[PDB]
Amino acid sequence: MVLSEGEWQLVLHVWAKVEADVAGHGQDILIRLFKSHPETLEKFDRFKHLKTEAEMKASEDLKKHGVTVLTALGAILKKKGHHEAELKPLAQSHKIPIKYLEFISEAIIHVLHSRHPGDFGADAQGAMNKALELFRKDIAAKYKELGYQG
Predict the structure, then answer these.
(1) Is the separation of the CB atoms in 101 and 139 below 8 Å?
(2) Which residues carry this modification: Phosphothreonine?
(3) DSSP alpha helices (H): ranges in 1-150?
(4) Residues forming the annotated binding site for O2?
(5) Residues forming the annotated binding site for heme b?
């Protein structure tokens, strides 16, 4: 998987907008994820009490974790694929199956298009899709290395 430097610039430009409201984006993303895939809620001790969108919006656990997710992902995306030093320990900490990373990728794309439609057209969406795909493949490689079949 390869992005052009132009595509990386699209990803970083929209990421700059994410960074103006990390917590709000994080909430929107996790809420979208949990509404699309409610079956995942039960897997997280810190989230399994959340049943409804109202409970999700009011949750400090969800807000704080949204910030964690986007901070980790932001640092990775800014490496423009040269993210081994960031990705190795992150893979370490995980479990989170690969399909959950797919779910969250989909929620990221949806939210960024919803919040920043001018700066997140077809080209930027494609670039972000590739960037998140590269991330998932590389983390999958780190998983399989330690035998977590992800």
Answers:
(1) yes
(2) 68
(3) 5-18, 22-36, 53-58, 60-78, 84-93, 98-115, 122-145
(4) 65
(5) 94
